[model samples]
Target: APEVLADFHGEMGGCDSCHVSDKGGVTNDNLTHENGQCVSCHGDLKELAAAAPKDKVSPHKSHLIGEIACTSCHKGHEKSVAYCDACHSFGFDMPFGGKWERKFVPVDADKAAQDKAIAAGVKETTDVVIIGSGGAGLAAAVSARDAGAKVILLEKEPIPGGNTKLAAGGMNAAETKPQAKLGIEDKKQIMIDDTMKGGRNINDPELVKVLANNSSDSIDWLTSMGADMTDVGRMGGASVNRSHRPTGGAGVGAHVAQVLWDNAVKRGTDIRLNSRVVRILEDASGKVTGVLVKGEYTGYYVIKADAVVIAAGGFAKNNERVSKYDPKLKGFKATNHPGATGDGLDVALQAGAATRDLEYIQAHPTYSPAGGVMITEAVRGNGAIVVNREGNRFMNEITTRDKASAAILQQKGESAYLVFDDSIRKSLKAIEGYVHLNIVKEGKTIEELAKQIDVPAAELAKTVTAYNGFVKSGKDAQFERPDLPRELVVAPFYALEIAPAVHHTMGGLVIDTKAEVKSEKTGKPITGLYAAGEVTGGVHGANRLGGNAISDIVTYGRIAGASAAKFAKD
Candidate 1:
C-alpha cells in the first residue's frame, strides 16, 4: 500500500503532481505548496470529517481534523503510520499497522560530528528561529511572523504540539469577556493573588504580573484564529471560575495547537518537524548567532538567525533528569509528550542561561493507572469527588495538585477513584474521550459503580447523599471542600482509578517579563535569546495550578516572539 499511494498518485500526475522536478525543491516553506497539492486532489479535512458519525470515535472525526497535516500520516514514500495514536489508542489502522511507540532517540551526531557542525559555516539564515512546536513554539512562531520577521521553527517530534496537544484542562485567564458574559465575576488582582498563593509566593512577581495582565488579550488572539474558548469553569487554587475552554468543555490544548499551527503555516513560518536543535549557537561576543540542528533526514547543518526563542517544553518525561532535580519522581510516569526531555533547557543552559524552579516537579492526582492517561483536574473542579476503596470521600477534590496527589497516596491502595454522575461526563466533552479509551467505569447507579470498582456500595451511596446535601446548601461540612459546582444527582455514574504521576516540571531557564533568557553569571538578559513555556520557568513557582499552563504558554510565548523579532530586526 505504501507504493500503491505513490503509484496511484503518479498515475494521476507524475512527480510534478506534488513536487517540482528535482531541479530545485518546491518553493513551499512549511511544505505549504506540497500540502496544498494534497487538498487540491482530496477535499479539505473539514469535509472528510463531516461524513463521520458524532456518537463514536472516528479518525477523520477527531477534534484535530484540520490541524494535522496530510504528511503527518499519509506518508507518500514511506510506510504510513497512525499519528492520532500518539495520545490515544483509537487503533485507527494506518496503511501499515505497527505498535504506536513514542521513542525519543536524542539526535546524536557524535561528539566529533558536533564540534565540526558548530565550526561549519551557516547554510541558511533567518531573522528569528524557534525550537519545539508545542503551544509555546507555535505561538512564538506565529507572533514572530506577525512581527514581520522571517521565522523558522524546529520541532524534534514528527508532529508539532508537544505536551500541549495532551492538555485537557482549560486556559486560566481573568477579567475576560467570556467570563463577564457567563456572569462569573473575576479580576486581574484576584488571579494574581491566586497565582501567588498557589505558587506559595515563590513565583517571580514580575512575570506573574505579565502573565495575568496579558492573559485576556491572549484569549482574543486565539479567538481571532477561529478558536472557541467560551466555556468557563473553576480549577484548583482559583477563587472564582476563570478557566476558559471550548464550548461544552472540549480539551483546550489540541484546539489551541490547531489554531496556532494554522496561523503559523498561513503566515509562512517555516515549521520543520523531526529537526532537533543540538546546540544553541553563541558567538564570541556572547550573542545568540543561531543553532546547530540535526534533521532526521537531512542530517546535521547550521542555521544562522539573528535571534532565537527556546519554547521547548520541560523534562517531566526524562526520568534521569527528573531524578536529578527531584529524587522522589525517579520512576514516576510523566504526563508529558515523548519529546519533553528538557532538551531546550539544556540547549539554553549550555548557551549560558540561568535556570530556576527545576526541582519543583508536580504530580497530578488523577493520572489513570490503566492507560497512564491524565484525567484533567477540571473534572474535580466541575464537580467530582475522590473516593477510597471503601467508597469514602477523602479530601477536597479541588485543592492544590500537590495536596490532592498526597491525599490520594495516603489512601489504602495508594490509589483512588474519581466518582461522578453522567452530568459531569456530559458537561466535559473530554470525559467522553476517556470513556472511549475504556478508562472510565460507568454504571446506572452509585451502588452499581461501587460494586464494579470493588467497593462497598452502602458507603458510596452515603457519600453521594451527603455531597448532594452540601451542594444544595452551598456549604460543605466534610473537609470544607471549596466549591461544589454540581451534585451527583443524574443517573449513570462513572468512576476512574487514579494515582499521582510527574505532571509538570516547574523549573527551567530563567527569564524576565520581557521573555529574554537571563545569564547565569551576570543575571542580565542573554543577548538575542528568548524563551517561553516550560522551557523557561518561574511562572508556576513551587506548584502550578490547573488550567494555568496553557495560559502561561500562550501569554509568554507571544512576548518571547515579539521580543525576539525586535531583537532580530535591531
Candidate 2:
C-alpha cells in the first residue's frame, strides 16, 4: 500500500530522473526509468481490453499493430504484489535466512587413500597431503590436481562442506555480466582499495592484491564448473562493481563448494569426508610428514603425504575460542555452521604455525532476533529500515553497517530495539527475509508495541518524532543515512530485540599469495600443505564487510586448488 521502494538518484530534483515507483514492476529493476509515471495510464491496462481481432500482416498493419502494450511485460504498480512470492520463495522474508538444499555431499577420498597407503606400508610418500576439507582444502585439491600432482583432501564435517555450505553466497566479480553493465571499470587496484576499506585497514595488502589480481579468473572458473549466479544487488561500500549473487537468491556457499567439488572430482583428486585430523605428525626436521586422522566409522588412520592443506573455516560457532582470540568478542554468539569450530587454527598452532589478525571480529548490523542469526545485508539493499523502541529511528537507518551496529549498541540500554511496520511486512515478507525472523509485532500501533518490546515509552516516542522530522527534511543530521527508500511510513508497527552479534573471524593459518600454506619459522612453504578459503586468512585482515566473505571463499578456494594440484605433481 505505502511505497516500500526507494530510488537512488545521481542528482535530485531532476524531473526526468529515475524514481522507485516505475522500477518496482520488474521484481528487481532491470531497466532505466523513463520520464514521468510510466504506470499512471498503464496500471489498469491488464483489465482494460484486448480485442481478438483478425491477424493483419506486415507494414505495421496500417501503422496500428496492437502488441498488448508495455504493461504486458511490465506489470506496473502491482509488481510487488504480483512477484512477492518470487522473492519470498528464496526466504527473503526473514532478515538473513537461507535454504539448505542438501546439495552438499562431503567427499574426502584423498584422505582415505593416504591412510590406506600408509597402512599398506609405502616407503616413499607422495608430495603433499592437505588437511581440513573446507574452502582451502578443496581449492588445494583442485590446484594440485591441475598441476598434475597426486593430492589428498581431508574434511572434518560428515559432509564435505564445512561452514562454507552455510554461507549467504555473494561473490565479487568485476567485468562480469551484471557488474560490467554498472561500469565497474576495475583492475586489481579497485579490489585492493575496497578490501582495505571494508576491512578497516587491517587487511593484509599483499593478500588482497593477490586476490584482486586473480579474482576474475576465480569467478570464471566457478562459472565454468557450473556455479549458479544471478545479479542480486550491490552495496554502497565498495570501489568495484562486483557482488554477484546466487540464482535462487539463497546462500551461495554450497554452490561454491559444488563447483570446486565437481572440478576436483573430475581431476581424480581424493576427498576424505568425516575425517578429522587429530594430530599433524611431523618428522625430526620439523617438516609435516603425515596426519593422524580419526573417523567415527573408519577409526584411526595415518595419512602420510608430502603436503597437508588446512581448509577448515573460522571459529564463529566456537564462543570459547572467539573469547580467547579477542576479549571484545568474548561472549558474542554466531549463527554460522556448528562445524566452524576453528579446527584448522588448533591444528596449525599445534604444528607451530604462526597466526595473525585474530583480534578483529566483524559484527553484522542486523541478526536474527536472538542475535546469532544473520539477516543478509542484501535485505538492507532491498529497502529495509532499522527502528528502535518508541517506534523511531535510532541511528540513520542507512548508515554504514559497521557504524550502524555500533550505534544500535549505544542506545538507552546496551541492547537496542528494532521496528519494521505493516507496509514493509506485506511488501517484503518478514520471517522469510530472516532479518525480522523473531521480531515482535503489534497490530499497527508503535505505542502499544513498545510496551510489549520492553522499551521506555517516552524515549521511543521522542525517537520516532525526530526520525519523522528528518524524513520530512530529507537529511539525516545524526548519521548520514543515505537516501534510503520510504523513510518513515504509517505503521502496523513491528519491533524486534537486536544486539550486536559476532559474525566472522578474519584470521587463520598463514599462506603465500599463491595460496601455499606457509610455516612461521622457516618462512618457506610447508611442502605438502596447501590452503585456501577462510582457513588461510589475510583477505579480511582485522574486519570483514557485508558480503565480502563469499568473495574470500571463492577467490582463495580456486587459488589454493590450482596451486596445490601443481605442487603435488612436482
* Residue ranges of candidate 1 with Cα displaced over 4 Å: 1-61, 64-81, 90-96, 101-109
TM-score of each model, paired residue for residue: 0.90, 0.68
Q: Where in model 2 is the C-alpha error above 4 Å?
A: 1-128, 182-188, 239-241, 262-269, 370-372, 396-403, 417-475, 482-496
Q: Using alpha carbons, what is the TM-score of model 1?
A: 0.90
- Which one is best on lDDT? 1
Tens-digit per-residue lDDT, 89-152, candidate 2: 2223322222332221223335566456456653334555666655556666676677766776
Could you give candidate 1's per-residue lDDT for residues 381-419 as a string of tens digits?
Answer: 889899999889889888998998889888898999999
lDDT of each: 0.84, 0.58
lDDT of 1 at 569: 73
Please state the error at residue 31 of candidate 2 in Å. 52
Residue 2 lDDT, candidate 1, scale 0-100:
27
Best by TM-score: 1
